[PDB]
Amino acid sequence: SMRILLSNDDGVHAPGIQTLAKALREFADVQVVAPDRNRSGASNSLTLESSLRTFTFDNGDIAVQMGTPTDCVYLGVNALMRPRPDIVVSGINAGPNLGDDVIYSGTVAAAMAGRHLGFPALAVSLNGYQHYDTAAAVTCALLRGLSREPLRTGRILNVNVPDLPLAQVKGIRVTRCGSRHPADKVIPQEDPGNTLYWIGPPGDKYDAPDTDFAAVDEGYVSVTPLHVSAHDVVSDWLDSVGVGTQW
Amino acid sequence: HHHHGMASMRILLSNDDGVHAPGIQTLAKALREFADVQVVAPDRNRSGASNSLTLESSLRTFTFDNGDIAVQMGTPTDCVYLGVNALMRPRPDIVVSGINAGPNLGDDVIYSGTVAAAMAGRHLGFPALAVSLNGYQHYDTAAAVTCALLRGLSREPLRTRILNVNVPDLPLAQVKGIRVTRCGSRHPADKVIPQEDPRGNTLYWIGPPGDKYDAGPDTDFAAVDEGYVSVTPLHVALSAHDVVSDWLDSVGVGTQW
């Protein structure tokens, strides 16, 4: 049987994560270590400055209090999950992780298997909020193949599932990540004298063929692998302004 | 050994160590010798925040009588994000980050808030300097090194991404000099430190970064070790399109046959 360390960015009690948990439990051992609240926009962040507390539920699930998606993978693999997981899966995220926005999303970040990435990590995101079952089915399909034939190249597996019934899905398509504009806007909110600031929505679609955007647009399930030279130009610039050197 | 120029440029200063940390404040007054410094930093120590940004709740901004701005529950990214977009009017020329208490060497950059504060993503507001002191004694040394490079930027601008700097904790007289270096690598951070609270429960600390895997010539590790000032031009990335596409057909997923 397969071992799964499941996590997300929306917290243990998210509709997405819990839907995925049950679907993967009928074929694989699922140990869920996820944040205590919604940590959307956490990315690589990991709590170094303070200690983290963990509460175990009756059903075996473990929540990380004030924790980030990365902590759940970190603490899970290293201390919490024994024996170690076969696969580290993140999701299902409520809301899409399309384009270059993946650099900021906590879900995709939980592909911080570099330690226990004997499993190429899986970041599954629903392009909507309605059909978490559809997205769970795709994950089930993709996890079944991994037990049958394992993957060699361990660039994470970012998946975007369109918010449609499973029958309405046209199929799968391997895509490279597109790109958005930077978010120039900041939404202001007045409190009962001061002003609060919200980080505005990411910029308009810039790059959308072979793009992870258009894949979802036509009905396909988008899949993207992800990873993480001007030495001469800098060294020449340093001597040009005369820094680090007397002349 | 270093004096101020006549360049009245604007600087957005942030860090991971928060507004009141010695590092950022040392650099704050040091750059105010020639430049117009506006410091937008987090309200507390956010070491290891990286690209994090509060997308689920609103942020509150406490302004000081000394021109500085603090962001309550904010991340190094927020301070730059809010600073450029709404707070700092007029906008900065360069977005310097530091000086970080503790070195940002090797693959510690992907998790470090200081380096992640230095993001030229919003505009060509960079090459944004990530300044990190290899120590906690000579905050002035690193400040003097920053002043040198910032003057250089006002002398002759630099095109194309980020500038990660690691200054050794030594007097400016003892500093060997400068050497442009590519980032080395550590054996991935693994430790989990358990500590017991007075109820019977156990609390967990995320352990220190792992042992230096790559250290030698032209690396950020050995550069500082010899006494030199390390400089790295950093950029994130996104190839094996065929391998994946063959696999999906191999295990028969997405396709009915």
UniProtKB/Swiss-Prot annotation, chain B:
Any one of the GO CC terms: cytoplasm
Family indicated by similarity: Belongs to the SurE nucleotidase family.
The UniProt record lists the keyword Ribosomal protein: no
Positions annotated to bind a divalent metal cation: D16, D17, S47, N100
GO molecular function: 3'-nucleotidase activity; 5'-nucleotidase activity; exopolyphosphatase activity; metal ion binding; nucleotide binding
This protein's UniProt keywords: Cytoplasm, Hydrolase, Metal-binding, Nucleotide-binding
Xref: PANTHER family: 5'-NUCLEOTIDASE SURE, 5'_3'-NUCLEOTIDASE SURE
Entry EC no(s): 3.1.3.5, 3.1.3.6, 3.6.1.11
Reaction(s) catalysed by this chain's protein: a ribonucleoside 5'-phosphate + H2O = a ribonucleoside + phosphate; a ribonucleoside 3'-phosphate + H2O = a ribonucleoside + phosphate; [phosphate](n) + H2O = [phosphate](n-1) + phosphate + H(+)
Cofactor binding, note field: Binds 1 divalent metal cation per subunit.
Stretches of the chain forming a coiled coil according to its record: none
Keyword rRNA processing among UniProt keywords: no
Gene3D superfamilies: Survival protein SurE-like phosphatase/nucleotidase
Pfam annotation, one family: SurE
Protein name: 5'/3'-nucleotidase SurE
Subcellular location: Cytoplasm
Cited function: Nucleotidase with a broad substrate specificity as it can dephosphorylate various ribo- and deoxyribonucleoside 5'-monophosphates and ribonucleoside 3'-monophosphates with highest affinity to 3'-AMP. Also hydrolyzes polyphosphate (exopolyphosphatase activity) with the preference for short-chain-length substrates (P20-25). Might be involved in the regulation of dNTP and NTP pools, and in the turnover of 3'-mononucleotides produced by numerous intracellular RNases (T1, T2, and F) during the degradation of various RNAs.
